[PDB]
Amino acid sequence: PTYKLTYFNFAGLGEPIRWMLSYLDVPFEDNRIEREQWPTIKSTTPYGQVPVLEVDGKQVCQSTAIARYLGKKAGLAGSNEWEDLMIDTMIDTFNDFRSSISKWFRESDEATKKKLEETLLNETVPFYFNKFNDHIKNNGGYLANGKLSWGDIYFISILEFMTTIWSDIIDKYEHIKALNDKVVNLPKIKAWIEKRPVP
Amino acid sequence: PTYKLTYFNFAGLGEPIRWMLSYLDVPFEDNRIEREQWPTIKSTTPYGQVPVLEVDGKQVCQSTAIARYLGKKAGLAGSNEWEDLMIDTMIDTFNDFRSSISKWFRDEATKKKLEETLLNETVPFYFNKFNDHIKNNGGYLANGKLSWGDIYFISILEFMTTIWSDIIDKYEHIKALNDKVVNLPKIKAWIEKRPV
Numbered sequence: 001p002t003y004k005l006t007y008f009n010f011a012g013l014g015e016p017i018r019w020m021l022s023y024l025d026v027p028f029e030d031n032r033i034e035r036e037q038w039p040t041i042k043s044t045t046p047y048g049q050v051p052v053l054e055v056d057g058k059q060v061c062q063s064t065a066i067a068r069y070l071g072k073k074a075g076l077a078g079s080n081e082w083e084d085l086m087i088d089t090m091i092d093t094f095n096d097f098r099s100s101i102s103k104w105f106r107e108s109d110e111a112t113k114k115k116l117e118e119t120l121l122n123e124t125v126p127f128y129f130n131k132f133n134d135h136i137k138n139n140g141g142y143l144a145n146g147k148l149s150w151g152d153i154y155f156i157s158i159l160e161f162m163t164t165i166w167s168d169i170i171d172k173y174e175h176i177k178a179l180n181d182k183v184v185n186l187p188k189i190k191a192w193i194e195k196r197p198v199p
Numbered sequence: 200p201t202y203k204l205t206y207f208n209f210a211g212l213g214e215p216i217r218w219m220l221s222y223l224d225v226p227f228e229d230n231r232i233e234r235e236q237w238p239t240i241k242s243t244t245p246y247g248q249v250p251v252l253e254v255d256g257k258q259v260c261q262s263t264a265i266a267r268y269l270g271k272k273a274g275l276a277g278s279n280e281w282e283d284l285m286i287d288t289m290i291d292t293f294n295d296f297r298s299s300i301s302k303w304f305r306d307e308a309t310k311k312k313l314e315e316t317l318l319n320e321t322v323p324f325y326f327n328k329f330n331d332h333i334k335n336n337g338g339y340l341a342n343g344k345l346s347w348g349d350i351y352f353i354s355i356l357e358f359m360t361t362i363w364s365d366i367i368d369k370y371e372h373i374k375a376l377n378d379k380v381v382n383l384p385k386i387k388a389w390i391e392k393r394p395v
């Protein structure tokens with residue numbers, strides 16, 4: 001198939017798809033958009049947002065849906081419906097968490113924003129990350145089913161983005177950091193990290 | 200297995216799971232939580248929220264994940280991974296739409312303003328696209344055939360209609376999809392026995 005990814009010129013929600021396509025070892029166009037050109041491109045997307053992955057000429061959006069699809073293609077999904085449920089539930093929970101990051105990112109009042117960041121760093125992150133940490137510990141060192149999934153790749157690629165703001169944030173969570181080191185050293189993901197544009 | 204669904208005593212995000220369990224034709228305990236008891240129950244849930252579906256005692260959360268799981272068990276998912284992507288992408292987009300709703304649900308004059316953006320901007324942006332998608336793709340959200348996404352979509356829209364009675368009336372293909380789904384025998388039977 002042909003693959004063309006459109007996203008902004010940073011990691012964000014494009015990166016899970018880039019990592020999955022790299023893991024899949026397929027060529028793909030990495031179409032990156034500057035923030036300056038976004039009001040132009042916005043009206044061209046199916047629902048006004050990126051990422052968009054064009055597969056054999058058909059535009060598909062939603063980072064999670066696409067990651068799962070590529071995960072199936074990659075052999076990084078479940079062996080049965082229950083195993084896929086174990087992956088899906090963790091990523092939907094992660095996406096509930098990262099909604100908090102989005103609220104903080106889009107706040108225009110600086111003092112409120114500082115208040116969101118405080119709540120985020122001292123209540124929200126511990127609440128979710130202690131559970132994620134305990135879950136990974138008790139699930140074989142992975143998000144789900146004791147084995148590598150597209151969920152692990154989605155989780156780590158997006159957490160890496162957080163490390164660009166709060167650099168130490170995942171360090172104290174031993175099992176999150178252990179999954180992080182494992183994923184970024186998958187050879188094709190490692191390669192992508194080495195060759196990817198480094199803003 | 201045994202199934203126990205815990206959610207509040209209204210439709211909301213529990214209703215897609217109730218509809219899917221009904222469509223699956225399996226017995227389940229419909230554990231409907233009153234707001235008064237929610238502070239007690241909240242700490243017992245995996246991540247502080249409902250719905251929670253207990254499957255032979257194991258707690259699973261996340262309404263979309265559960266609906267997809269039950270969808271696959273019910274023969275209402277895709278025939279291949281492309282077809283499953285077609286369902287999954289529409290529902291994640293619908294969940295983006297829903298996210299705008301959730302903020303309203305969370306001062307009665309600032310509520311009145313959030314509600315004007317929802318009805319006047321957010322709803323028309325999304326529902327025009329959903330309506331035309333359904334129109335030009337066989338009368339369903341994905342792949343020209345009934346999926347768990349249709350169930351999820353219509354059940355949550357039905358709950359939105361209990362607040363904004365005319366919200367889908369101008370979207371004739373959405374309304375038509377609604378009418379198809381709620382007249383499915385297993386669904387219809389649920390709608391008749393559920394709390395008023």
Ligand SMILES: N[C@@H](CCC(=O)N[C@@H](CS)C(=O)NCC(=O)O)C(=O)O
Nearest residue numbers: 012013048049050051062063064295
């Ligand atoms: N649920 C969507 C969220 C996509 C999304 O939020 N895209 C943002 C960038 S991360 C965007 O397009 N912002 C530009 C805008 O909203 O105009 C997904 O997971 O792909």
Ligand SMILES: N[C@@H](CCC(=O)N[C@@H](CS)C(=O)NCC(=O)O)C(=O)O
Nearest residue numbers: 096211212247248249250261262263
């Ligand atoms: N992504 C979750 C969202 C769950 C959610 O937002 N649950 C709300 C009710 S619809 C809740 O439990 N509110 C009570 C609380 O947060 O204390 C899902 O789809 O199940």
